[PDB]
Design a protein around this ligand. Structure first.
Ligand SMILES: O=C(/C=C/C1CCN(CCc2c[nH]c3ccccc23)CC1)NO
Ligand SMILES: [K+]
Ligand SMILES: [K+]
Ligand SMILES: [Zn+2]
Length: 638
């Protein structure tokens, strides 16, 4: 299986610049590229990536997405002086040409195909291309908004032609609408395009009616274009995350893309003078993370906009950090999306309900500037510690390890005399393992998470949980698959309990979330809809310091467990301790692999049972006043 992350860059693409005064264009500078690469070298991240040489896109390749007439006209700009280059630029909207921009445009294009080839040939798992000029505004016969050729559109057309790909997801988190991408794929159901963007009721550039949420595609491609307009500036992490949990991820995991291309503009980051949003660079570590379980991790990130040289550097690093699998930063202060965002989110969901099954219940009323420096993100010495049953030896990935000092062994006796009596001398070894693994996770940056196999649940959960609280871990999120009650108090706001059961259980308070999904064929799609639209939004607002996973000895969800384990590592900087009751070679192989940061096997695209969606929306109704990040409609005033 593939390993590593590509980084495609070349100082040559910084060798074109604006040559006359023009305040429309004054912001697109060469320094964007060199600041971004220098931030990656300063943080050690460039050195950790496979450097892949840039190349030129050939003439045949440029014609995948552009007309001969336009290619011929651009081919002439290297022969042009400054008067002639100004005359040529004035024919297009918000774009300047330079003697060397045709050259760099072919480099920005070829660099993107270089990235597509490395990911699709399994030479890396994923990667990023720092390129200039950007692409996503470019159109079949026109330059637009600093873009000459449509790099991201090339990538999808090229991956279609040369790899026989059926499904390609393009995620455009630039703050501008990528209308060139939309035009190119509006009739193509094989490319799903998602774009959020500053719209301000069409008063923001490019001022297009088609940038609105009602453009869903055309013809055989309706439902594979999703526009999410931001109609106010100042959008926050909670707005961006709400867009992902309630619009983008439900749609993306059902589409099941074979490859993910990101138009990564960081003008949607705090401090940018074009986007004027308020999302912290760290959010891009999570935007990247939430997409990495798609398509076996095959993700190509292509740089677009980004104009505040400082936020630019930090958001680039948070993205590459997540591409290399480093632990994600904790996001604090999350809650409800703002009213304008909830209106936009609500309006997209309703128009898209004709096309996607996560939104289909909406259609019938039967069931309807300075900010703090981000912290350091070091990968653990050993990422994952595993404790299988005694004497069982397994094939472990290179970043895992097996696990009792005397310090820890006195503690187990201390606990035993007080609260248990019990003498089963190996469930006493399990609690030695639980404690020594927990001590390694929290006291150290050298171990990240861990999995322990246990036999007695309630004693194991008690010590795991109590040893985590009195450590201290501010909050613990507990995720439990099974039935019966455990020794967990949801009393204070220090524990939140997700439970996945089979018998229906009336919930009382807003610090427990109980999902009784009907067993059968639709169990897999229902679990994913709950994971994306209930569990992740609450977990993210709760902001736990530790995640405790617990599986009862019972099979039915061996298909979904790796996705959850991967996604849930967006909480608590990845510190998650999983207790498996009983030995299952394959469930344990699967848990360790997701915890180790390996690739997740895709699910493929069978729609969930309506009884299950009724159950999940009753849970949203019951929790969204305490947990605002669950909201995907505007609330009604008194
Ligand atoms: O991020 C990007 C970059 C997109 C660009 C889009 C176009 N505006 C130009 C703004 C503008 C239009 N008329 C003006 C008059 C005076 C001053 C300024 C302007 C700049 C950025 N693409 O992804
Ligand atoms: K966008
Ligand atoms: K499309
Ligand atoms: Zn932009």
């Amino acid at each position: 299986a593939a390993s590593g992350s590509a980084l495609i860059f070349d100082e040559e693409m910084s060798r074109y610049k604006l040559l006359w005064t023009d305040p429309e264009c004054e912001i697109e500078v060469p320094e964007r590229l060199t600041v971004s690469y220098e931030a990656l070298r300063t943080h050690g991240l460039a050195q950790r990536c496979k450097a892949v040489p840039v190349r030129q896109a050939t003439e045949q390749e440029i014609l995948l997405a552009h007309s001969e007439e336009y290619l011929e006209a651009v081919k002439q700009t290297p022969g042009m002086n400054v008067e002639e280059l100004m005359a040529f630029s004035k024919k297009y909207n918000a774009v300047y040409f330079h003697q060397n921009i045709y050259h760099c445009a072919k480099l920005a294009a070829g660099a993107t195909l270089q990235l597509v080839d490395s990911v699709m040939k399994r030479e890396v798992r994923n990667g990023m291309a720092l390129v200039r000029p950007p692409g996503h505004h470019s159109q079949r016969s026109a330059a637009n908004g600093f873009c000459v050729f449509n790099n991201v559109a090339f990538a999808a057309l090229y991956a279609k032609k040369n790899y026989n790909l059926n499904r390609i997801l393009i995620v455009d988190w630039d703050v501008h609408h990528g209308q060139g991408i939309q035009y190119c794929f509006e009739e193509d159901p094989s490319v799903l395009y998602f774009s959020w963007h500053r719209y301000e009721h069409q008063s923001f550039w490019p001022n297009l009616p088609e940038s609105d949420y009602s453009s869903v595609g055309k013809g055989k491609g309706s439902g594979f274009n999703i526009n999410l307009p931001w109609n106010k500036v100042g959008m926050t992490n909670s707005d961006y995350l709400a867009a992902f949990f309630h619009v983008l991820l439900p749609v993306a995991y059902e589409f099941d893309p074979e490859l993910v291309i990101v138009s990564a503009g960081f003008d949607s980051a705090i401090g940018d003078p074009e986007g004027e949003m308020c999302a912290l660079p760290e959010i891009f570590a999570h935007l990247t993370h939430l997409l990495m379980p798609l398509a076996a991790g095959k993700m190509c990130v292509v740089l677009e906009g980004g104009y505040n040289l400082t936020s630019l550097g930090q958001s680039v690093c948070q993205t590459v950090h997540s591409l290399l699998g480093d632990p994600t930063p904790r996001i604090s202060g999350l809650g409800t999306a703002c009213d304008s965002a909830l209106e936009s989110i609500q309006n997209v969901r309703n128009v898209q309900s004709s096309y996607w099954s996560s939104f289909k219940h909406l259609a019938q009323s039967e069931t309807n500037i300075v900010w703090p420096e981000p912290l350091k993100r070091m990968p653990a010495s050993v990422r994952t510690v595993v404790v299988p049953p005694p004497g069982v030896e397994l094939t472990l990935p290179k970043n895992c390890q097996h696990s009792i000092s005397e310090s820890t062994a006195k503690e187990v006796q201390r606990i035993r005399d007080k609260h248990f009596d019990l003498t089963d001398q190996n469930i006493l070894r399990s609690l030695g393992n639980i404690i020594s693994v927990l001590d390694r996770m929290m006291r150290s940056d050298e171990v990240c998470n861990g999995c322990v196999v246990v036999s007695d649940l309630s004693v194991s959960v008690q010590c795991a949980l109590q040893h985590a609280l009195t450590e201290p871990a501010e909050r613990v999120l507990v995720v439990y698959v099974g039935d019966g009650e455990l020794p967990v108090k949801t009393n204070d706001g220090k524990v939140f309990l997700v439970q996945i059961c089979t018998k229906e259980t009336e919930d009382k308070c807003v610090n427990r979330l109980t999902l009784c999904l009907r067993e059968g064929e639709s169990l897999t799609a229902g679990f994913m809809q709950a994971l994306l639209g209930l569990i992740l939004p609450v977990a993210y607002e709760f902001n736990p310091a530790l995640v405790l996973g617990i599986v009862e000895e019972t099979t039915r969800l061996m298909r979904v467990w790796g996705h959850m384990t991967c996604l849930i590592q967006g909480l608590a900087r990845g510190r998650m301790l999983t207790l498996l009751q009983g030995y299952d070679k394959d469930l344990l192989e699967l848990t360790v692999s997701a915890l180790s940061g390996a690739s997740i096997s895709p699910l493929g695209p069978r729609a969930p049972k309506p009884e299950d969606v009724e159950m999940m929306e009753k849970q949203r109704q019951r929790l969204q006043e305490r947990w605002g990040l669950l909201r995907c409609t505007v609330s009604e005033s008194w």
